Structure 1
Amino acid sequence: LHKEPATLIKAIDGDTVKLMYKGQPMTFRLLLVDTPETKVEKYGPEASAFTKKMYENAKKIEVEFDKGQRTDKYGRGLAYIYADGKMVNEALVRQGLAKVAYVYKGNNTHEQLLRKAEAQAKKEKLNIWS
């Protein structure tokens, strides 16, 4: 897998962000995470505020597609997003602001990594695991 640069256009909510990728605007859906939705579930506004902060204060945003299907049926890009080298997908799960989702069409490269972060958040009874 390789990381490619992108530019923040707009944070939408916990699991979705609009980025300029290779010249055009695109909506991305974070791989392997399910965050509470604001469109308003419990912790939904916290999860979206958390990612908004990460995206807006970053010097560099990068997107990493996995080896499976790269867009869902709604036309969203499916990827791991990094803010200053830190994976947002991972940070959400570790902070207990998202659960690890079921693998979608072969996109499982970092599933183990996220599974471990989630077990730890669970042990610490963080947010959603309260």
Structure 2
Amino acid sequence: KLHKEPATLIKAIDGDTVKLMYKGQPMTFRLLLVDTPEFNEKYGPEASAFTKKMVENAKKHEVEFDKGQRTDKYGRGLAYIYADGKMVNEALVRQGLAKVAYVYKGNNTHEQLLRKAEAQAKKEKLNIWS
């Protein structure tokens, strides 16, 4: 089992990065197991606005690291981010605003939960899958 840890929102950045204060330190977090389009690309504006609204409307923010590396090579935190108990990573996939991606062994605990979400977004022809 993974565990959720406290954070506070500093600011939204784009579809799959968000700035949070974690153990009292400002950090950029990159969402595990997803890829949103860059802001300049199609559905990038929509993905950014999704993640923005989801984190800005929540009152409680949490970080859940997986079993492997907790930071990437750019110094970004690698985690599942929750907003009022709802996983942002999974929400993005479910709405077709991210692809499951960057699935590395040992940091892949929620791989199947997200693939299930992606199949449903694809069935619904949502956004990326339209």
Q: Once the two structures are superposed, what CA deviation does each residue of 1:83-115 show, in whole Å capped at 9, x if it has no partner?
A: 000000000000000000031251010000000
* Runs of 5+ unmatched residues, structure 1: none
> 4+ residue stretches of structure 1 with deviation over 2 A?
none
Q: Secondary structure at the match of 2:48?
A: helix
Tell me the distance in 2 between the aligned counterparts of 1:22 and 1:6: 7
Is it true that 1:112 corresponds to 2:76 in the alignment?
no
Q: How many residues align?
A: 127
* Runs of 5+ unmatched residues, structure 2: none
Q: Secondary structure at the match of 1:128?
A: helix
Percent of pairs with identical residues: 98
Tell me the distance in 1 between the aligned counterparts of 2:52 and 2:105: 27
* 8 Å CA contact retained: 1:6, 1:61: yes
Q: Secondary structure at the match of 1:13?
A: coil
Tell me the distance in 2 between the aligned counterparts of 1:69 and 1:105: 10
TM-score of the pair, normalised by structure 1 = 0.96
Q: CA deviation at 1:59?
A: 1.0
Tell me the distance in 1 between the aligned counterparts of 2:71 and 2:93: 22
* 8 Å CA contact retained: 1:28, 1:78: yes
Q: Once the two structures are superposed, what CA deviation does each residue of 1:33-86 show, in whole Å capped at 9, x if it has no partner?
A: 00000xxx0000000000000111101000100001111000000000000000
